Design a protein around this nucleic acid. Sequence first.
RNA 1: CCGGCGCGCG
DNA 2: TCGCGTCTCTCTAAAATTGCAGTCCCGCGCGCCGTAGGAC
DNA 3: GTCCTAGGACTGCAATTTTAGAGAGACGCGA
Lengths: 726, 21, 172, 49, 585, 83
Amino acid sequence: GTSTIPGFNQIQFEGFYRFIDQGLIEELSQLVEPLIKERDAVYESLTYSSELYFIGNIPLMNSLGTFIVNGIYRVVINQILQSDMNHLKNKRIRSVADLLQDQLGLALALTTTYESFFGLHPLSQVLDRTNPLTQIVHGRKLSYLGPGGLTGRTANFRIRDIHPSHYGRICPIDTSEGINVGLIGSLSIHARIGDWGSLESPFYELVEKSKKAQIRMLFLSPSQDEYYMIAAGNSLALNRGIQEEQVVPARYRQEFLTIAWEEVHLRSIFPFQYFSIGASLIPFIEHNDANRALMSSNMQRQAVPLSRSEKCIVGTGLERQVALDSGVPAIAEHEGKILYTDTEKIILSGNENTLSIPLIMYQRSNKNTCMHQKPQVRRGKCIKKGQILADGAATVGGELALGKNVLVAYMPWEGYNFEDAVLISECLVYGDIYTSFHIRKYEVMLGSWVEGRGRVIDVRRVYISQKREIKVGDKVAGRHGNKGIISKILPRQDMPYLQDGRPVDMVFNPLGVPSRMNVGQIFECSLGLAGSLLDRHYRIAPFDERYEQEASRKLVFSELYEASKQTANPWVFEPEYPGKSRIFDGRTGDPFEQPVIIGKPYILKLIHQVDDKIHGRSSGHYALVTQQPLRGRSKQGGQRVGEMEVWALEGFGVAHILQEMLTYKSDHIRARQEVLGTTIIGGTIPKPEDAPESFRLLVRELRSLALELNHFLVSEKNFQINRKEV
Amino acid sequence: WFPEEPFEAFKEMRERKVFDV
Amino acid sequence: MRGLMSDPQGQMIDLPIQSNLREGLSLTEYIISCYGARKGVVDTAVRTSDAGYLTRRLVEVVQHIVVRRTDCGTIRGISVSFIQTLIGRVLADDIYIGSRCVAFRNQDLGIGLVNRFITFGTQSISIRTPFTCRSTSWICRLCYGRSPTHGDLVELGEAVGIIAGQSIGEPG
Amino acid sequence: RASLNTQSFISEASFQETARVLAKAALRGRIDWLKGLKENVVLGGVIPA
Amino acid sequence: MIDRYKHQQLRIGLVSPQQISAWATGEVTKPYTFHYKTNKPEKDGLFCERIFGPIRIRRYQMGYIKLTCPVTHVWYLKRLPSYIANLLDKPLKELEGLVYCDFSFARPITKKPTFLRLRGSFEYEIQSWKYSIPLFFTTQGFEIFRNREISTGAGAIREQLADLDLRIIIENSLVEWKQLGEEDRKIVRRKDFLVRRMELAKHFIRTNIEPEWMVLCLLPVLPPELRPDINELYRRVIYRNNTLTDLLVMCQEKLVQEAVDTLLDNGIRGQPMRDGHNKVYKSFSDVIEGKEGRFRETLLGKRVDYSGRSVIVVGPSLSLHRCGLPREIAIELFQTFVIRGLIRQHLASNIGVAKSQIREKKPIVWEILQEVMQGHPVLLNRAPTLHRLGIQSFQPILVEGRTICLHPLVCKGFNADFDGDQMAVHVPLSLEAQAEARLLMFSHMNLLSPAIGDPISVPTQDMLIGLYVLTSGTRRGICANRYNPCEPFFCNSYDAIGAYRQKRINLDSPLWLRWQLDQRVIASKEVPIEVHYESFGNYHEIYAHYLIVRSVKKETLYIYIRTTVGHISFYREIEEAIQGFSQAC
Amino acid sequence: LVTFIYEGLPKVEQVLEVSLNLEKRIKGWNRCITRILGIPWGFLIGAELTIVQSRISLVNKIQKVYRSQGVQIHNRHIEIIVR
RNA sequence: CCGGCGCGCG
DNA sequence: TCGCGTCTCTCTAAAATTGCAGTCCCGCGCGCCGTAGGAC
DNA sequence: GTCCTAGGACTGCAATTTTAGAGAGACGCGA
Ligand SMILES: [Mg+2]
Ligand SMILES: [Zn+2]
């Protein structure tokens, strides 16, 4: 990784090879290739493992860095623990090499314990296969939790904070949301694991004349990171003196300075050095507030692969790396020529070696997302080893493609984009722009339309495909932390339209920018429109203002003017208000009073949608002990009325609504049956007057502690004490 | 603030109608 | 401009963020601005777990307080000498201007009466508050005052304790 | 502390230190007259408000 | 007014062994739970059908375990401060040693005569007492009088508690307190112990509680249907009690006591005893206490029927008192009412046929659902209910799709935005609940927040910007004219708005409006800029925002207001709202 | 080389669960009123003066914390808790 | 129709 | 022939740490994994 | 394969763990 971005799975790949190299020998103080194929292990629910000679079976790691146990893909994540306590120089990272070798220590004191390690260990997790982005980022996580590690309650408040030793090793943006915030980390793009368990990042050495210095790119462990003056600025500054006493910002001894160039030892020159994969896919990230950068990274991991995929007009240039390192596309393992291509397979022949490459056709993920592959080559094309052969799901031309380029306006529309709602056009529906395939598994004739309604596609285990077009209540988001729920769908004649007569596809609330402080979405939408007219795509590395002031503004404005001039569309670039244009009301034909920022941004469709959240219940099954309605949509359970909800009802004074939801809608067995009968005949519901089964349950438990709890009623008429049955 | 002096405090509660004879 | 940020252990970073989000943060400035981004998410995880605990204890201590009487019969009255506090309180004593009675005992304090008190030289105002009620297990209508939402005097059977607990814990 | 010195042992038991409250109360035959809102919620009855 | 008196009480109390037997009468004698082969309840076991009932009564019928030796209750010995230690007036260490170690107590009882000078708790066994006294006194008679001068374990504690004279305790404590007072850290703590002891002894006199019930002779057994972990602890008590009676030795007596303590309250003896998986057992105290316990999870909050959930979307066309319900949620919640509607109009033969019709989504099911939802309110509720406005009542209407349609003006009270939030829906069933929801919880009587009284359904964001732009007046001064100046006149507001509709004037173009009401325009309290007095008597007074024509001959007075179409539109909107509401009633 | 030495919600929760002047006045008042007045006017007046001062400062401290953050809560709600 | 572990949403 | 500080414990009054007990937002969704051990 | 089969963080508080205060019975030295 001295001159290129390293493979995102290189840490897992190197760790496993080290375990085979010295971990096996160091613990035994001879392996044979597995008989079952990798596809066969998952197809019929086996474990991809190799035999050790008969001591046991050693699981094997896939070239993507994931194991298979019982036909389930699993990932072993890294752990951080104590080797200034929060300094990274007092930490160590335990990879899969340390976790697999350690279990060998327990194993020799094999097959069963390794099987139980992947099933039960918290650091072993099921691989997320929602989209190609989730497959790779899962393996690069760093955790303080796990055995030997601090718990969220155990976590110190000084931990979860950003330490200056993290720069270039741990991404300062990516973290978990909730109680586990600041305890789940993520490796940087250029980060590497050293020989002492420390994280290293590459820095460029500036050295004096009298030194060979064959390679000027050298990796720093955090221990030696302090004692170097590292600069991130550039050398494009000259005055009447000379270049050496020009001042630049620099890092030294956990603080930031401003010293001359002659006192700088190392330079940070890589563009993606300080960020993870999630934050490195946000174009114009330097114009977004870092708070929304964390949420934007999470949203990109929930994007659903669409039935048809297309590349983004504006990107960062890391999409190609993500596609290559995810394994979703087909990559040639041998040079040669293409001879045959179809849906089921691709035939490649080279150097008297002819191979047949099967292609994935409508398979299911762990998150009920479809996988599919289409050829990317034609017969008679020469291929180098390592070049793409086919495109997988959410991948076009060897790039990650999680969304669509749609025409968008930023204006309020009659309250249908109130707060965070999104108004879309019917063209996105009947055009199948945001249609995705979803497949469930259930433990029937093939090709039958069951009635969860869908088409049975595979029987082994029943797999049912569901074609889901975009709908009201679905969630869409951009790559700048701009999420929203679809609340209205309009015919194309009702949407606002541009000065070329084209209606827009989505309308966004402009009020969501100032409070959220993500200006990068305004930059991307304007440039996306320019690229579509100019037939151009843009892959822009972040922090382009290092070249000059307002570099993103110059790039977007000049490309907008080029598209306006070349296509003879004067509304595309307006000298009075660049980026904005007057659009017309689709209902009246009258222009809106103010110019509206328009463009063609990249919008994603997320997993969180209706048809998986709508729940309803009348009555049904109750718990065995508490006799209360079950919990969960899948169990047809009811909604909980918690103690905070009870306070609100008591504040309203609605004493009879509260008693309804305390006795004969929850656990009064006798009164639940009568309410079912009275409501069907409409004959008035009487008061329960008895105790619900939750109070009787508590009385028996108190009886088990040798305590008696009796409920007595004293008559206000004759003062007779009545013992209530409990 | 009621003054720290006990008799001044007594006069204060007499004036603020906290306590009286 | 985004100004200056602060490192986790209180101290300020000796480097300003002199650019705004429209201009585009430099790589150094973006890293520094991540310090406050981490603080916001972490402080969220403690603002909720603490206020929720605070709200439960707040509601619990006064859950049993309900308006159960029209008038406890107390004669004590807190002396008052600002406007938003006096509105809705019930006078515990008559108010006189010269030989004329301008406000009677057991009378709701409107804002016109308060302005009249301020306009003239009225030094002491005696009002009935929750501190003056002859009970700690319930409150009466006159010692509570006007309803917080219904405009008139508070009604019997109102669970004012839970409303009091929710009102304080809600903005936590 | 004020919420643990009330006139109801059901309100204290459902608030904090359930075992400590119940053990102290059951020694002296403590009587709860259900004058509060939370006491009647536990029993499922109508709150007196 | 005579108050409608209601005298209801519940009282806890320490239980007696006789009341335990009355609960059971029925003794569990075998530790077998179920048959390994036939899967039937083993007789005399933890799930015995004879003891507990046929396989409703199994949820309430209690059993008991007849312990061979009495075992102390852990709550009353190990919890600090110890009640048994305070009532017996001995340090906790010696009592714990007597219960857990091989210690024998000298002179445990008083109401029967003795003949020995054995006092205190002798840790070492008495050498003479081992052989000399028993061998001279033989075995039968010695054992007959054995448990009167020396005893050990919880039996000695129970004997000490049974013969305690509470009044003598109170008098001795009071006299010792007086002696201490008449004479400085634990000179006070000893006093505090004395005060605590007389208050503890006083409570026993006035109640029916006996201090010897603090040591258990019988162990009540939870009904089987409440324990379909606890079962494992019950087997141990039978496992070690049945071993003890086979012997009839001190070690097994302690094992029974530890089994009961673990069953009653673990995690109180320092190290809590774990299972074979190195996991701490869960005792009755654990399941009744804590945030997840019975009190704070099962009793203070309940899951309910006739409830639903879906994603929230904005509806700007809704009324303030209406909400949109998904068809599936509505048909689930109102299922019984739809069944009644089907049967009532003879379109369903019985309940089963109606349910089958509902399951088939017949087109006539939706007509009945729409009919029965009219006038029946529902309760919406967002997750973090921070105040009472977090749950409100609305009139449901049938909307297409799978989302709940929510009014935009009630989002602030719910603290809701349309980026993924969901809500729960509840249906009041009885007439009283429906009346409560309609007359107390609807949004149109809840316009003010209870915290301070500010309005809660105030226009925000988009509506606020719209109103601000509408009421933003003319451009004035150098922003209106390029040069130093060295407008249409409308009879009524309808003429001005009509001219605006025909694009004759802009939203913020100045105009003069003839005013035929009183002067009610908010403006700065300023004298006229210019008064144009005519020699015929008429004079024109020109203010910053209006022109007034007056005369000295007549009493005429004409008013013209300088404004825009936006101000006129705002005023007309509010005026027309008031007039329409007045006319509709 | 050289060393230089140079110069909300937790607050409101601390007051609720229990001012420097308040605890100094309570200490001063306790030792004086009982010595001046004997039979219950020693205890009744002392308790009345301490509680009246405590309520004024307890409400003031809580209101000051909330007013500093723009939170508007009526004095009635706080007086219910303080009572 | 029972509990733990992991991942998420508001 | 006792008398005198006093040798050697000696028993308890009065702080001084110190080891537990108690607690630490709410409401939803999904997946996986249990239920172990040993002589046949 | 297996069939029965037996480690935060803060507050509260009583509980040691001394520290100390006096202090006395038998006494080796001594007047
Ligand atoms: Mg939201
Ligand atoms: Zn009162």
